[PDB]
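User: Is it possible to get a 3D structure for a protein together with its bound compound? The compound here is chloride ion. I've pasted both below.
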Amino acid sequence: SFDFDLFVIGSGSGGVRAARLAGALGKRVAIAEEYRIGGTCVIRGCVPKKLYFYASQYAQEFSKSIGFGWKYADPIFNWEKLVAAKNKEISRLEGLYREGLQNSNVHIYESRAVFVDEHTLELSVTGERISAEKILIATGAKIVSNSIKGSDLCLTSNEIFDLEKLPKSIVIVGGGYIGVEFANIFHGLGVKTTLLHRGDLILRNFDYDLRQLLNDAMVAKGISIIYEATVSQVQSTENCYNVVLTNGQTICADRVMLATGRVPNTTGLGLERAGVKVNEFGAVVVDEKMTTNVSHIWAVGDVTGHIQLTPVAIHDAMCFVKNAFENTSTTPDYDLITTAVFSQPEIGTVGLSEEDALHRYKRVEIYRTVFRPMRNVLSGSPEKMFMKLVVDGESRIVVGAHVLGENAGEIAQLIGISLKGKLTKDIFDKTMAVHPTMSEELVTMYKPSYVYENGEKLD
Amino acid sequence: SFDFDLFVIGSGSGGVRAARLAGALGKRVAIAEEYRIGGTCVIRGCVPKKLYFYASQYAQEFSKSIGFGWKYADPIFNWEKLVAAKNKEISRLEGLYREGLQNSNVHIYESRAVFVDEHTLELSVTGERISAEKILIATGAKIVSNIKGSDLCLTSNEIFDLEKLPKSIVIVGGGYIGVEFANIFHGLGVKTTLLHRGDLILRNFDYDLRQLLNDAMVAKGISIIYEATVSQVQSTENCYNVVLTNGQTICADRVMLATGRVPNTTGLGLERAGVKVNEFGAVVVDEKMTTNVSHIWAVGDVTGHIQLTPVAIHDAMCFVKNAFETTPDYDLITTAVFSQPEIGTVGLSEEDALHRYKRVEIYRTVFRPMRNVLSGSPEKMFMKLVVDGESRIVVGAHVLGENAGEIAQLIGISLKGKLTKDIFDKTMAVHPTMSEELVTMYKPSYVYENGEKLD
Ligand SMILES: Cc1cc2nc3c(=O)[nH]c(=O)nc-3n(C[C@H](O)[C@H](O)[C@H](O)COP(=O)(O)OP(=O)(O)OC[C@H]3O[C@@H](n4cnc5c(N)ncnc54)[C@H](O)[C@@H]3O)c2cc1C
Ligand SMILES: Cc1cc2nc3c(=O)[nH]c(=O)nc-3n(C[C@H](O)[C@H](O)[C@H](O)COP(=O)(O)OP(=O)(O)OC[C@H]3O[C@@H](n4cnc5c(N)ncnc54)[C@H](O)[C@@H]3O)c2cc1C
Ligand SMILES: [Cl-]
Ligand SMILES: [Cl-]
Ligand SMILES: [Cl-]
Ligand SMILES: [Cl-]
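Assistant: Yes, that's possible. Here is the predicted structure of the complex:
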């Protein structure tokens, strides 16, 4: 006999969903959380990121009000107030997650848990051993080491929200979604911002138009983007951290943030005591039912090595609860996942980039538009809206959709439903426009911008 | 034989599209416009309404910023600057529509056109007569005749051009134009009262949209008076005294009538054309947009159907195919209302669905966007999917809150594709968004079986 029917390791997006649901089914469940209930997205990820994103937008929004007849005093921002508001909000959410677990009778152990053997965990804080019939690994991901001389002088996303003061200048190392989001946040709050990227253009693996349009808007508004940049060392000086690149260039900034990737959090977990297989990328290997190679051990979320997104971790958890406790294999579905980047301008994307599409399909029709939204007409703002549909010319199915500009994430989520449905471009065109909107442009692009046949654009 | 292959009467959304298309096909086309090229939407309709909506919205942006750490910025609005900005933009758009016509080699007549006989129009400005093989009536709609002292009130035709922002305003009518202007003026700081003849604003919309908008408007300090019929409007020394049939009076600096628009045939001389008009003033057309006179067609608001620019455009496209080269599709039209909060709606209301289907599953959510939790705003987001329990097809979708019109447009594509609720559910959420609520409502809020709600 085991102390619990199920022991969940980590109370983040996936773990907290799985544990609450199992407990509601009447199972005896425990969850270990070494930090804060709710996990990465709630405490120090998507939720506070989005709040800071909103905070940083207001200055540019006020400047748009002038064209409509408004005047106002030069705007002043107070970082300490934002930090206090963020902390109130994440504490509220944390409490609500905790309550949800407890309403389902889940016992919360406020400690790291590690495996002792296949059915036994040890709580780091006290040394207590707890046994369980089933164990769910939901430990998320962790920032890569960065071993850069002076790496330990730099901030990560774990520290970035809680600065004592807004910096005068900041260097962001990394041009993936985290780095571009925070570059635009700090720049919007009046910080002199430099972004370093190891390759030739930000947001590798996104459609090229999204990468290029974002890059160009960031540079135009005053963010410095340095490419082919590898940091050699970060050195402390009295007035700033000196970031020294391998090519000799130096950048001195008040703070330096590393945003260089997160990997599955499986080191020091005792997986080798349980016999759980971990691959060369540090991922816990799971099958189509979220099962490890040990039949009573499952894993969900970032730790399993797939795309690191909160909705996907929740999806995994739902699949796990159905499989472990029912005769009904939900299998996870990672096709046609819509993603957003809360850069400024914002990005939304689902399905295939233009380039991936043109190699995949014999005929690809591209419907592309860049336009000035009506609101920017009056305001004199340089902000455009970009929308592109990528179409398989033989089936007429819309196989990719890419959006940059205001609420691009919202827009892409919704287009993503249509793409999940494999709706054809003809159905988009048949849909009556709602006027005046931005979204109506998507249902009135009757003629293609251009077409590829066998990878080659036609003149 | 005739002066033109096609003569288009009216240069609004419908007429301008028809004329440009026909001209591009190589036809000899003329168009007559008595007022301004581009018509009601461009000049005194959707476009400037949306500009004024955006102007009003900035007020809440200033107040929401405070919770995010921005100091109060003493925002002050200046109506005269808005009006000048609007005039510049509407003039810009007008010229682009003029350029479009010229590019298609459409001969433009700046005059009212009047039928003299079934193939002949007379231009009122010059007295010139012009013959045409085919004629398209695209003359739009106009305010209803309206109430003693009604000549003291403004309509949407004058509302954009007030010399100054009023201290107070009474809006007569609780359709979409009335609720849009009530929220614009309230947002700009005007003491606003909205009068409606019935019991709840926005007749023919899903009940939740009607009720939640009503509650939000009242809650923010817009007075809404129901069962209110205006007996007369009186010019007193300091304000316009609006006297109701129930005896109640409301005195306000300005009074706007938003009481409905009817098909416009004023001065058209249709009796000479042989064209039949129905009891509501509509030029009756068949499924190919043809009047009872075989060479005279009609598109847009004048035909008596739903009054929307995109439908006028759709009518135009159908007309040119049938006339020169198809029946319009009025099913699953998405509509938006630029109230505050905004509304977006497509397909069937919950009430219309529960009578049409044996089983209707309702998926309803009301929540506070996280932006508002932090800023202290009461604004909610409301989303409702109406689903046929048998086919699982999503048959209606109703949104209220920020960017509801944008949202409804995009949901509209999926509905036009007849996507099932299971497809919505299989669509991965994007986090954090408002729109992800639409793809994670796995369990129904409630269900109707045979027209009754189940326990
Ligand atoms: C800055 C940032 C921004 C992001 N923005 C977005 C976004 O906008 N949208 C999006 O979809 N995703 C976003 N993500 C990703 C999102 O946070 C993750 O994909 C999601 O949190 C993964 O859920 P999870 O359950 O796998 O792991 P987590 O939520 O990371 O939870 C793992 C939990 O386990 C705890 N833990 C780990 N090991 C142990 C142990 N041995 N014992 C006890 N507890 C343990 C941790 O403290 C943590 O609470 C962002 C991430 C970051 C870092
Ligand atoms: C305040 C307001 C807000 C609106 N908001 C929206 C909205 O947000 N979204 C939406 O889709 N719709 C909206 N509409 C509706 C939209 O304006 C109409 O549905 C659309 O303009 C109709 O196009 P139409 O071609 O039928 O006629 P119109 O655009 O009205 O064009 C008719 C033209 O004919 C001219 N004319 C009339 N008679 C003659 C004649 N005998 N000779 C020469 N010229 C003539 C008129 O001057 C006018 O230019 C709004 C309308 C109003 C009043
Ligand atoms: Cl949850
Ligand atoms: Cl690409
Ligand atoms: Cl047009
Ligand atoms: Cl209803």
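Chain B touches chain A through 75 residues (CB under 8 Å). Chain B has three domains: 1-143+260-331, 144-259, 332-455.
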